[PDB]
Scaffold this motif. Structure first.
Motif, PDB file in Angstrom:
ATOM      1  N   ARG A 122      36.835  36.409  44.809  1.00  0.00           N
ATOM      2  CA  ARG A 122      36.428  36.381  43.403  1.00  0.00           C
ATOM      3  C   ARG A 122      35.382  35.289  43.185  1.00  0.00           C
ATOM      4  O   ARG A 122      35.570  34.137  43.602  1.00  0.00           O
ATOM      5  CB  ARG A 122      37.636  36.148  42.484  1.00  0.00           C
ATOM      6  CG  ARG A 122      37.326  36.284  41.003  1.00  0.00           C
ATOM      7  CD  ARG A 122      38.172  35.364  40.145  1.00  0.00           C
ATOM      8  NE  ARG A 122      37.785  33.973  40.316  1.00  0.00           N
ATOM      9  CZ  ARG A 122      38.517  32.937  39.925  1.00  0.00           C
ATOM     10  NH1 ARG A 122      39.699  33.118  39.364  1.00  0.00           N
ATOM     11  NH2 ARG A 122      38.063  31.714  40.106  1.00  0.00           N
ATOM     12  N   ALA A 123      34.287  35.654  42.514  1.00  0.00           N
ATOM     13  CA  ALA A 123      33.299  34.643  42.142  1.00  0.00           C
ATOM     14  C   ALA A 123      33.950  33.610  41.224  1.00  0.00           C
ATOM     15  O   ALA A 123      34.886  33.920  40.489  1.00  0.00           O
ATOM     16  CB  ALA A 123      32.081  35.270  41.438  1.00  0.00           C
ATOM     17  N   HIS A 133      36.554  45.314  38.327  1.00  0.00           N
ATOM     18  CA  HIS A 133      36.381  46.183  39.488  1.00  0.00           C
ATOM     19  C   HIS A 133      37.618  46.083  40.349  1.00  0.00           C
ATOM     20  O   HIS A 133      38.363  45.106  40.279  1.00  0.00           O
ATOM     21  CB  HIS A 133      35.094  45.897  40.295  1.00  0.00           C
ATOM     22  CG  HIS A 133      35.019  44.533  40.943  1.00  0.00           C
ATOM     23  ND1 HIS A 133      35.275  44.312  42.278  1.00  0.00           N
ATOM     24  CD2 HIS A 133      34.677  43.333  40.427  1.00  0.00           C
ATOM     25  CE1 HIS A 133      35.107  43.030  42.557  1.00  0.00           C
ATOM     26  NE2 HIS A 133      34.747  42.414  41.443  1.00  0.00           N
ATOM     27  N   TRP A 144      42.608  41.794  36.650  1.00  0.00           N
ATOM     28  CA  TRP A 144      41.593  41.260  35.743  1.00  0.00           C
ATOM     29  C   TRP A 144      42.131  40.838  34.371  1.00  0.00           C
ATOM     30  O   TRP A 144      41.493  40.022  33.689  1.00  0.00           O
ATOM     31  CB  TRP A 144      40.436  42.256  35.593  1.00  0.00           C
ATOM     32  CG  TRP A 144      39.561  42.234  36.803  1.00  0.00           C
ATOM     33  CD1 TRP A 144      39.460  43.186  37.774  1.00  0.00           C
ATOM     34  CD2 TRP A 144      38.692  41.143  37.220  1.00  0.00           C
ATOM     35  NE1 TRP A 144      38.566  42.765  38.756  1.00  0.00           N
ATOM     36  CE2 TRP A 144      38.116  41.513  38.436  1.00  0.00           C
ATOM     37  CE3 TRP A 144      38.372  39.903  36.672  1.00  0.00           C
ATOM     38  CZ2 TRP A 144      37.173  40.681  39.108  1.00  0.00           C
ATOM     39  CZ3 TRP A 144      37.466  39.075  37.363  1.00  0.00           C
ATOM     40  CH2 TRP A 144      36.888  39.486  38.549  1.00  0.00           C
ATOM     41  N   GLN A 200      26.708  38.473  40.039  1.00  0.00           N
ATOM     42  CA  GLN A 200      28.115  38.166  40.319  1.00  0.00           C
ATOM     43  C   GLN A 200      28.546  38.724  41.658  1.00  0.00           C
ATOM     44  O   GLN A 200      29.329  38.081  42.382  1.00  0.00           O
ATOM     45  CB  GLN A 200      28.984  38.705  39.190  1.00  0.00           C
ATOM     46  CG  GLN A 200      30.406  38.193  39.196  1.00  0.00           C
ATOM     47  CD  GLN A 200      31.179  38.705  38.022  1.00  0.00           C
ATOM     48  OE1 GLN A 200      30.644  38.856  36.915  1.00  0.00           O
ATOM     49  NE2 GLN A 200      32.436  38.975  38.245  1.00  0.00           N
ATOM     50  N   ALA A 233      30.106  36.468  44.647  1.00  0.00           N
ATOM     51  CA  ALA A 233      31.469  36.731  45.117  1.00  0.00           C
ATOM     52  C   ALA A 233      31.587  36.614  46.643  1.00  0.00           C
ATOM     53  O   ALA A 233      32.675  36.363  47.158  1.00  0.00           O
ATOM     54  CB  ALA A 233      31.922  38.122  44.617  1.00  0.00           C
TER      55      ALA A 233
END
Ligand code: BR
Length: 219
Positions: A80-81, A103, A200, A55, A59
């Motif tokens: 953001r991925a 994160h 998130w 990931q 990203a």
């Protein structure tokens, strides 16, 4: 130099699975953890090699991620991925919880954590930081086992289903379903933890996924 072993160990820890030594880490991880890919925008599972998906690499790849706008980027992660990985904890064919990687930026470093969420998509069963570079004794106390223990039983959303977790400066109330103690003397790291959940849990993060979990999507 595969520190994917520490990552597996941390996933087992936050899931409540005791494992000692590199051999037992791999065996229990393979037995009880199912990595799955999730499309952030929809919250749907997607097909792909979840076990080997990177990931962090995605990203920063133009075709695999988006640049966040200044207003969107509450956690200061810049991009953001498109697709994230989550880790289902399995009890037989039943899913007992889901571990979410999150994160966000602290004062000195990008801070990465796993959060174990129950199948109501709201109650926290565990939290562990697995990469952080704040000052030992100050912001590094996100690793303190007593601070992590405070997260257990906290609720991510209120009854309007909007994000509600608060990192409370000076300490959270005894009765609080949503409040967690801030880090004494390290208010700026603490604000980074807050921002991490603000992003998130919202619409650009795991918000859509946790709606599906709430509505019974893991069993
Ligand atoms: Br990401």
């Amino acid at each position: 130099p595969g520190h994917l072993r520490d990552k597996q160990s941390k996933i087992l820890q936050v899931a409540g699975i005791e494992a000692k030594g590199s051999k037992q880490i791999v065996e229990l991880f393979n037995k009880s953890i199912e990595p799955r890919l999730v499309d952030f925008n929809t919250g749907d599972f997607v097909e792909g090699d979840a076990a080997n998906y990177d990931q962090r690499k995605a990203a920063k790849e133009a075709s695999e991620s988006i640049k966040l706008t200044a207003e969107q980027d509450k956690a200061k992660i810049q991009r953001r991925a498109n697709v994230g990985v989550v880790y289902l904890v399995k009890d037989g064919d039943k899913t007992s919880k889901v571990i979410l990687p999150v994160h966000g930026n602290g004062l000195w470093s990008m801070m990465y954590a796993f959060v174990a969420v129950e199948t109501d998509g709201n109650t926290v069963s565990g939290l562990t930081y697995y990469e952080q570079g704040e000052t030992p004794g100050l912001g590094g106390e996100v690793e303190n086992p007593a601070w992590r223990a405070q997260w257990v039983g906290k609720k991510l959303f209120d009854e309007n289903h909007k994000p509600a977790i608060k990192i409370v400066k000076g300490g959270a109330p005894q009765g609080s379903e949503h409040g967690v103690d801030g880090l004494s003397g390290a208010t700026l790291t603490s604000n980074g933890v807050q921002n991490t959940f603000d992003f998130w849990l919202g619409d650009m993060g795991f918000g859509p996924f946790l709606t599906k979990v709430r509505d019974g999507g893991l069993n």
